[PDB]
Design an enzyme around this catalytic site. Sequence first.
Site, PDB file in Angstrom:
ATOM      1  N   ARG A   1     -19.417  14.453  -8.845  1.00 39.54           N
ATOM      2  CA  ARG A   1     -19.477  15.323 -10.008  1.00 39.54           C
ATOM      3  C   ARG A   1     -18.600  16.553  -9.789  1.00 39.54           C
ATOM      4  O   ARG A   1     -18.449  17.045  -8.668  1.00 39.54           O
ATOM      5  CB  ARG A   1     -20.921  15.741 -10.293  1.00 39.54           C
ATOM      6  CG  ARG A   1     -21.059  16.784 -11.391  1.00 39.54           C
ATOM      7  CD  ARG A   1     -22.510  16.982 -11.798  1.00 39.54           C
ATOM      8  NE  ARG A   1     -23.051  15.811 -12.477  1.00 39.54           N
ATOM      9  CZ  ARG A   1     -24.346  15.562 -12.632  1.00 39.54           C
ATOM     10  NH1 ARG A   1     -25.267  16.442 -12.273  1.00 39.54           N
ATOM     11  NH2 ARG A   1     -24.723  14.417 -13.192  1.00 39.54           N
TER      12      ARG A   1
ATOM     13  N   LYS B   1     -13.737  14.360  -3.844  1.00 40.47           N
ATOM     14  CA  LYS B   1     -13.816  15.595  -3.075  1.00 40.47           C
ATOM     15  C   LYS B   1     -13.379  15.445  -1.623  1.00 40.47           C
ATOM     16  O   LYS B   1     -13.228  16.462  -0.936  1.00 40.47           O
ATOM     17  CB  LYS B   1     -15.247  16.147  -3.110  1.00 40.47           C
ATOM     18  CG  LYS B   1     -15.748  16.463  -4.507  1.00 40.47           C
ATOM     19  CD  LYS B   1     -16.887  17.466  -4.471  1.00 40.47           C
ATOM     20  CE  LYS B   1     -17.465  17.698  -5.856  1.00 40.47           C
ATOM     21  NZ  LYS B   1     -18.533  16.717  -6.183  1.00 40.47           N
TER      22      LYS B   1
ATOM     23  N   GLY C   1     -16.736  26.084  -2.615  1.00 37.59           N
ATOM     24  CA  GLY C   1     -16.157  27.351  -3.014  1.00 37.59           C
ATOM     25  C   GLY C   1     -15.117  27.172  -4.100  1.00 37.59           C
ATOM     26  O   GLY C   1     -15.226  26.254  -4.917  1.00 37.59           O
TER      27      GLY C   1
ATOM     28  N   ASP D   1     -30.170  18.361  -6.420  1.00 41.65           N
ATOM     29  CA  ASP D   1     -29.277  19.426  -6.852  1.00 41.65           C
ATOM     30  C   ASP D   1     -28.658  19.063  -8.196  1.00 41.65           C
ATOM     31  O   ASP D   1     -28.306  17.904  -8.437  1.00 41.65           O
ATOM     32  CB  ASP D   1     -28.181  19.670  -5.813  1.00 41.65           C
ATOM     33  CG  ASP D   1     -26.972  20.371  -6.395  1.00 41.65           C
ATOM     34  OD1 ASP D   1     -27.155  21.389  -7.096  1.00 41.65           O
ATOM     35  OD2 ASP D   1     -25.839  19.906  -6.152  1.00 41.65           O
TER      36      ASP D   1
ATOM     37  N   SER E   1     -24.565  18.418  -7.799  1.00 44.47           N
ATOM     38  CA  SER E   1     -24.201  17.082  -7.355  1.00 44.47           C
ATOM     39  C   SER E   1     -24.586  16.045  -8.403  1.00 44.47           C
ATOM     40  O   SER E   1     -25.515  16.241  -9.191  1.00 44.47           O
ATOM     41  CB  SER E   1     -24.888  16.767  -6.029  1.00 44.47           C
ATOM     42  OG  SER E   1     -24.578  17.758  -5.067  1.00 44.47           O
TER      43      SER E   1
END
Lengths: 176, 229, 233, 226, 234, 247, 231, 202, 142
Positions: free
Chosen positions: B36, B50, B64, B183, B186
């Site tokens: 995500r 990622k 970040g 979370d 995510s």
Amino acid sequence: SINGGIVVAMTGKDCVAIACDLFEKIFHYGHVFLGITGLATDVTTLNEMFRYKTNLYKLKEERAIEPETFTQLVSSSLYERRFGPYFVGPVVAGINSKSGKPFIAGFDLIGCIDEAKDFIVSGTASDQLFGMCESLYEPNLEPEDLFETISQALLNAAGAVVYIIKKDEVVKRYLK
Amino acid sequence: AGLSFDNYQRNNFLAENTTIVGVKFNNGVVIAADTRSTQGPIVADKNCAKLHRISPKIWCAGAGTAADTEAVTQLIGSNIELHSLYTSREPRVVSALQMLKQHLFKYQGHIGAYLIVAGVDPTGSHLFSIHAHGSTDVGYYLSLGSGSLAAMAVLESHWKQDLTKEEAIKLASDAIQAGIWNDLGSGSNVDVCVMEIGKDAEYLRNYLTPSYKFPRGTTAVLKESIVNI
Amino acid sequence: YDSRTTIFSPEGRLYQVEYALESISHAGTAIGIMASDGIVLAAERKVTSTLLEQDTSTEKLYKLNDKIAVAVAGLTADAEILINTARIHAQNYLKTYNEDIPVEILVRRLSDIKQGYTQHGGLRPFGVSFIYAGYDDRYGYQLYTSNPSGNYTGWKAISVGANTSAAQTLLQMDYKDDMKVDDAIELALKTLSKTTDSSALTYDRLEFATIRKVYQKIFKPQEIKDILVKTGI
Amino acid sequence: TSIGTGYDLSNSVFSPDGRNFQVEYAVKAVENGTTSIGIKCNDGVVFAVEKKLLVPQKNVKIQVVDRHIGCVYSGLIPDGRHLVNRGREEAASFKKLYKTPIPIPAFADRLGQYVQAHTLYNSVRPFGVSTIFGGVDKNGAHLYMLEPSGSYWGYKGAATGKGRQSAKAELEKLVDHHPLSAREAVKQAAKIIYLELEISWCSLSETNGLHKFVKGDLLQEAIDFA
Amino acid sequence: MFRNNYDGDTVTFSPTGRLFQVEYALEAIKQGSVTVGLRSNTHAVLVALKRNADELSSYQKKIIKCDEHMGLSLAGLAPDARVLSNYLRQQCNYSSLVFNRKLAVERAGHLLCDKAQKNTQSYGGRPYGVGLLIIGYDKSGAHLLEFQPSGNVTELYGTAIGARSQGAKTYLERTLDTFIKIDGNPDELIKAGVEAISQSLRDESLTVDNLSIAIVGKDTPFTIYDGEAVAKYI
Amino acid sequence: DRYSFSLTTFSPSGKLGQIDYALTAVKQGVTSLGIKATNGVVIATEKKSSSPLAMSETLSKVSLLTPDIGAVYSGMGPDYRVLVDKSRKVAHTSYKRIYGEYPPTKLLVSEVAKIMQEATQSGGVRPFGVSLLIAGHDEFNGFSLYQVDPSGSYFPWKATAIGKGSVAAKTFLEKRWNDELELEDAIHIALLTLKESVEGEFNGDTIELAIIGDENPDLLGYTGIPTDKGPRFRKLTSQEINDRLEA
Amino acid sequence: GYDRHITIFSPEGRLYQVEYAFKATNQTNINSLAVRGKDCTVVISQKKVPDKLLDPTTVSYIFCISRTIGMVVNGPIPDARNAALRAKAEAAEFRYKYGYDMPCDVLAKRMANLSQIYTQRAYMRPLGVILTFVSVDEELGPSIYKTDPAGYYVGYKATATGPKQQEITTNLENHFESWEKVVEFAITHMIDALGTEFSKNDLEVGVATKDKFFTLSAENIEERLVAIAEQ
Amino acid sequence: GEVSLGTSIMAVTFKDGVILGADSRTTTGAYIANRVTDKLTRVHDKIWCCRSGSAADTQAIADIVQYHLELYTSQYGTPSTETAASVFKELCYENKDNLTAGIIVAGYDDKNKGEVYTIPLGGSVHKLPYAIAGSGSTFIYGYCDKNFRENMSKEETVDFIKHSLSQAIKWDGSSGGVIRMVVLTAAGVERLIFYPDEYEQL
Amino acid sequence: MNIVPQDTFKSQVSTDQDKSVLSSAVPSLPDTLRQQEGGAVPLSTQLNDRHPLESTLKNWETTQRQRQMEQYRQIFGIAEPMKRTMEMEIVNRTDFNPLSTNGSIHRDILLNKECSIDWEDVYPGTMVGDDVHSKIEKQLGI
């Protein structure tokens, strides 16, 4: 005010669409189209800069820049001003001349790349248009179905222009 | 030269108007992340990859400011490539860690990249975390991002010495799933990359993956023109 | 006196710059012709051999901009340094004024660059002379040359390199300023065919371009061969 | 061939034989200087030199660079002065940094590097001085001779200047006789010079490891021995 | 002859180690006019024969003052004398400003030695070609230093520099036994200096315009006597 | 001292002496050659060694500039090494860091030529005493082969050779080259040309040969990005070279 | 002309000033040998000290550059010590920047590139020394790399250097468990090549082991010579 | 929000040398980012330090020190611990306005036979028989001051450091995990580790 | 012996501090046409509210170099930093090139930046005073 407004790009079969609510905020550098939202001063500065860069590219390479390479150029040119960025939300759309792959991408102020395959929105009313595009969008739209989808979504975002881009031709249209 | 400051005062005046884990195992290290991506509360892109590559066997994932993590990761990947060419040697993960932390230190934390760096090299498998201020710590397992606490909870509940490759991939993907579920940042798919000390790094894109169209002529065309380029 | 470019001789002449000029007497001839409706550029590829990739050796004619091209004679390394400086200048001008650079402003900038290397002692003159063809809406079609000395002149037709005297004599006899681009192409080809040291003006020994209509074309060897046989060489 | 015409008028030039003739000429400058010797004892080192309106208590040739290390040079006065002062700066900075007397080999290294650097560029000339220096040390006592090339080695004895050949020969005979106390070495240094006198010494037993001048009674006794 | 090849700069030694370019700067002192200096234990005196370019011109200022304790005498190149005097006086000042201590004369001389040495070894400059006599009085008493532009400094009881300095220096060598004892009677030391500078004269005599004197001591800051003030000593 | 006079200057003939002498230093260097095939490029050279005790595996005369681009040289090896270091650095800085992709061979050759040219203007340095054969592939320009000379001039070649054997090698290539060669044919012609050009022992350890070809995913070092492209540059092992020589 | 004073090309295409910098390397008559064991590298140098007054304790041309790298220099000692300090600072800088001990061949490459600078700048003379680096690399194992004033470098199975280097090299070609045996082997071949039965102070010896580089002391060279004389 | 080395570190000189001990917890607020971090940093073979304050600035300082001391060792042979402490002092002080670093330096050195230097945040340097620092040191000042003795044996000093660091871990939240120690002596460097089950039951 | 650049702010300011760009008519004020900065409007007083990083990032490399020279002075003595600096100045002073922006190939070797990239490498970043002659005059100090 002519600052801000909204740009959206969207992918079809063998085609892409890019549209904005309109001075002008969609630019093209050969067969790669860049839409920029934000401060009109920064929009103009980015247009001048990317015209400079892509003219030098075309002169050195004897070749028109491909949309993926232009996307990386935009990313790196935005990050160059990492401190005091341009207050802009650029969107690139185009088709690779070799593969015919329809391509769209969008950026943050400092050139993070979304490269999302379905649709990209930037600027004012972004969450409204995110909802519209998610609801209306379906994959593999035909070029005219894609035109209807993009244009209706844009009209329901809140006087507009639409580019329909083929590999070999581009159609520019306007909307009230 | 360098990163320009040339609109700092201008932009001031105008303003006055994820889960990542690394898991070391008996012969390697696994790094995994969710896919995500979000702008504010809005999912800017699902299936965002990622896991960055610093070198063939040195891979990276970061949190970040995304543009910062990307830029620093590609700069250090360029420096590692050039250094490997200069020395004709497969690059060390400690060298990437050193130059990455010295770069982040040069910018005194203003380049807001937080990273987990994992790799294998001629001296074995390595797994490091790096913080935007340039502080590093080694670990056998690590987690990062908003879901870092849920993933660390899973790792600390299920991690053990001498995990196998398959057990380590299972543990990493379980910790990413726990992030996805617990979370909000995510979500969507799990990416995995597996580096074994003797082997090519095995990247595993989407290792886990947990009508209204209007009729033609609906929109009021005002006028038409042909643009040619 | 000739050891360095910053020393005047007792005759008041800069031998190092005259030697930079003489360097061009050994470059293959380039020729440029301005017609009522466009400009022709042509050049001999004196460095030639069957193992050279003629199809990709674009090596004397370089476009600096739309509506502007240069023909190069002399040191190709210096040539491409100056060409890239001029391209950058033209794009800076377009960026600043949003208008295409006037051809004479670009020629002037390049000639000032070439001059400066004759004036600082740690630099040698560029061993290269350009012919500039271009169009702007002030002077229309216009054609220039510039020397290693960094002086320039506007020309209706000009030749540079080895046999410039012969080519310029043939131009002075045959040139007439109401000719068309299609006439100037044939006059260029005739001139080079009579000027070349080759036994024959084979298409691989030529580079050819035109600026007309505004569009510029650098000919691929196929259409070069066709234009040759159409001219009858 | 000693002249090397065509490879001599500029520093840092190698001749076809790989010789740097400007360095050989700076060596030949040393061969003109006041004959100077140094002798290494069992316990220390001693230095001596062969040397009216001058203030006599201010007319001194042996230079103490530091209490730790004594220095004597021959060749160009200003070059000698400059090298001495550079060495005194290097010693003082070493002492400020590491809170210990500069080891004689470290000092020697620093001076050799400073002289050698003057052989690299055409914008500078080699020092026209050869320096003998030495002192008591953490590891004992060391005697060095630093040539204008920047080449240096430890020595049991060294001589420079116009009389260097005979001084070397007699100091080598001396070494062959003692394969020395500070007293005996002082006497032999006085003799070698005689073969005005000024002497200084550095020994753990007889100068507490400091450098000190040999003056008054012991100087007169050394002259009596000579 | 062959000297012509190896004398072009301060950076070439000759095949004999001469370093001619420094020798020529030491010969540049011999073109200077004579000046004498001498001291007792309590006082130090400088004496200088000034010159003028033409009878329509004033005499050139040959002696200077670093501070109230020390002073200087020039012979040789005027530009280099200017440089070194400005340097010596900027050091005397910086010393006073930062430490509030009179710069020791010996230290000032060593500073000149250091400054002068640099020009002997770099290619681009040239040696200063000027000799200086420094006198002063401090805690250590009266001082006289002779500076040579090779970068050599010696502390002396007396000396002379300039074209015929050899005469005055020979005279002083005969008489040092007398002047060093002249303590508390500076007038006799000044008269001894004027006598010493009365040798080495040629076609000339000492006059209130051409002769200049200065003195410093325990009870006497650096004072310059010139013009009618010199008639007491001629 | 603010200025240094230009070390390279025109002679009264109009010829730049130091450029001629650098080209002479190139002529003095050991033979190297390259050949475009239809489906690749070959570059090859002799590993002349000053001793049999030298480790030939460290005499890397052929070096990768990009996964698609490689270089070889004749002349001053140290100059070639420094030029390789700079060309790699510029390939990353000027191009990969801007456009996210490796430069085309034409533009990296242009960058090397620019670097070599500026040593011809400086008054501080001599020109480089090397010429480089740079072979590479580009997605659009395809396979390409350039020769860069000490002047910083460059030209595209179908085949070329430089160094002592340069003229005889270029004649053998001109008689044996044709527009239909396969990469194995080009490799065979290269090996025969070098056998004819080499001095003394001709074996797989006195030669090295690299190719630009198809991607080698077994050289990529990772798996699972299917669009990602293995290097096209590949140095042949001395085992493989010997197996060619047994043909 | 200028090609004699500065490192520009002569019409022959030759940098005479670099070739003359090679001849500087033989101005000392010392010659030296390096050899590789299975797990150690040994370097043998002559130590010519005929001068009774010269203290042979100080006369060494072998430098310890790093924990794991040593080098022997052939050529004048001032330039050797300069190169030593340079290499030592570069090894420390490499360790600081990249976090692992500099490989011997990367240090050789760095020093060769510096020598290229000195061969290409007009106003910098070449350094006039030949550097032989010896190490046991953690990846390559024992390795020897030698660097010339021209800035050429290559790896070697063994080397010799100095006026008689051909005799040693040819003896090694004729030839081609612990480092003490390798030292004794190298000393024996130096003796066989040069024809001089060394005194304990006619030699200096350096050994690179898996863990460290060290130089033998005179008592260690003595016991090596004794162990040779047993055979 | 920079990483700060919340810590309890403790160096103690003894008969044969010096022992340097530390906890192994590091915290980002209440989160333990690593519970088994090795805070003991080798700057030289027989010269070790412990870091406090920011992790980034102290790591940069310690890396520059290790560079400086390796260069020194390559020039002069092994440094003394006083040399290392001098380098630490100079780096901490000349950057004191930009960097917040506090260091305990421990090292063996055969002329001095083991020394301890502490460099608090100001960049003062104080040689001491033992030093404690970090958040958890505050809770054990009275224990170390009462129980420390000069010229303890190795075993007595290991016991003393265990009891002190165990109390620091007991009372300080920011310190915990395993206790790690290095023993520095003429015999060499010896790593020691003590686990919670070996020091909580004390 | 600094890590972060300390001395980073001008202690004194004057209208004449900027040399080579002074008015020929009144040698006390800037030449705002030759400055080409967009008028006088970039008055020197506007050097205020600088980015906190800028004053350290501009001169970071200079500070690292100064620390390195200091370390070499402490450990190796005055000879080593002198040699390094002399080499570096020789390179800087002999490389004159008014057209190239690129750094010298040998400068990178001396700096040991042969295999290093930084953003100043990746991002190396006018009607008056841009000419080659202005660079000649700056370099010779004409």
